[PDB]
Design a protein around this ligand. Structure first.
Ligand SMILES: N[C@H](CNC(=O)C1=[SH]CC=C1)C(=O)O
Length: 288
C-alpha cells in the first residue's frame, strides 16, 4: 500500500471534517455525479496555541480524482495523509547546522513518510536534483491575486519592483516561489520584501487579500484563477510568469515513474484532464 502525501489546496485538494460517524458527507458535482472522497489523515487545527491532533478527514478534488485514476490504472492500493508541517517543501539548514534537509512534502517523500506526492506540486530543477517528477499533469504558472479595483499590471508593476510599506505583497512560506525570485539577481529586493510577510498557507493569504490586510498575493495561476473566478471580490492580474508544470513526485530511480508518466500522457490524450477541468476548475459563476 503506497503512502500518498498531499496538501490542502482548492480546487486540487479539498479537506473537510468527517461527519460524527467517521463517514464523508455525500455530495454531487454540478452534473449530478458523486463526488469521490478518500479518507486523509492529517492535522485538523493549525491555530497557534491549540493542540495539534492527527485525525481522519475527507479529501477530494482534481488531484484526488487523478489519484483514484492512477491507482486503478496501475493497480496499486494507497493511503493518503496531509503533510505534517503544512508545506510544499524548500531545502533548509537543519538544527542550526550547515547540513540541509527538505521540509514539506519534499521532506516526507525523501524520508519515506510518503512514497508519492500527489498535489499541485511545482516541477523545478532544484527539486529535481533530489526527487523525480512525472511529466506535468497540468501546465500553469505564477500570477497575482488582488482585490477587484486594485491598479496593478503584473510582476513588473513599479509598486512591486519599488516596494514601500504602503503596498504589502507576499507568497506562501516554504514553497518554490521564493527560490524562483532568489534565482534571478534582478528580482532581489522583491524576494527580500516578501520574506518579511509570507503566509503559512495559500488560504490564509487569499483571506488576507479579501480582508484588505494583503494587497497582492503571488501564487500558482491554477489556484488563483479558480479562487478569483469563485469569488466576485477577487481578481488576478498580469501575464502569467515562471510558467511551469505540476507533477507527481517520487523518489529517485522510482519503479513507478515511467508508468505514472504514461498514465498522465493518456489523460492528456483522451480528454480526461479536460473533464477534470470541467468538474473542478471551470463550471459556474462566482458565488464566493
Ligand atoms: N505549487 C507550489 C507553489 N508554486 C511555486 O512554487 C511555483 S515557483 C514557479 C512557479 C510556481 C509549490 O510546489 O511549492
Amino acid at each position: 500500500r503506497l503512502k500518498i502525501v498531499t496538501i490542502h489546496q482548492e480546487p486540487f485538494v479539498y479537506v473537510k471534517p468527517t461527519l460524527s460517524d467517521g463517514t464523508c458527507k455525500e455530495e454531487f458535482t454540478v452534473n449530478g455525479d458523486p463526488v469521490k472522497k478518500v479518507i486523509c489523515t492529517g492535522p485538523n487545527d493549525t491555530s497557534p496555541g491549540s493542540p495539534r491532533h492527527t485525525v481522519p478527514q475527507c479529501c477530494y478534488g482534481f488531484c484526488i480524482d487523478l489519484l483514484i485514476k492512477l491507482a486503478r490504472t496501475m493497480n496499486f492500493t494507497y493511503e493518503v495523509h496531509l503533510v505534517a508541517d503544512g508545506k510544499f517543501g524548500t531545502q533548509e539548514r537543519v538544527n542550526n547546522s550547515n547540513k540541509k534537509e527538505w521540509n514539506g512534502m519534499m521532506g516526507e517523500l525523501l524520508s519515506g513518510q510518503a512514497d508519492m506526492i500527489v498535489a499541485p506540486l511545482t516541477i523545478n530543477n532544484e527539486r529535481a536534483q533530489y526527487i523525480e517528477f512525472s511529466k506535468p499533469f497540468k501546465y500553469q504558472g505564477l500570477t497575482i491575486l488582488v482585490k477587484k479595483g486594485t491598479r496593478i499590471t503584473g510582476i513588473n508593476d513599479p509598486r512591486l519592483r519599488n516596494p514601500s510599506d504602503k503596498f504589502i505583497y507576499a507568497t506562501v512560506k516554504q514553497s518554490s516561489v521564493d527560490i524562483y525570485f532568489r534565482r534571478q539577481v534582478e528580482l532581489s529586493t522583491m524576494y527580500r520584501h516578501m520574506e518579511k510577510h509570507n503566509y503559512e498557507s495559500a488560504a490564509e493569504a487569499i483571506q488576507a487579500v479579501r480582508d484588505n490586510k494583503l494587497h497582492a498575493f503571488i501564487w500558482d495561476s491554477a489556484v488563483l484563477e479558480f479562487e478569483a473566478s469563485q469569488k466576485c471580490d477577487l481578481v488576478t492580474t498580469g501575464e502569467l510568469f515562471f510558467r511551469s508544470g505540476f507533477g507527481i513526485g517520487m523518489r529517485k530511480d522510482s519503479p513507478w515513474k515511467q508508468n505514472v508518466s504514461l498514465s498522465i500522457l493518456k489523460s492528456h490524450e483522451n480528454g480526461f484532464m479536460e473533464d477534470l477541468d470541467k468538474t473542478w476548475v471551470r463550471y459556474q459563476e462566482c458565488d464566493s
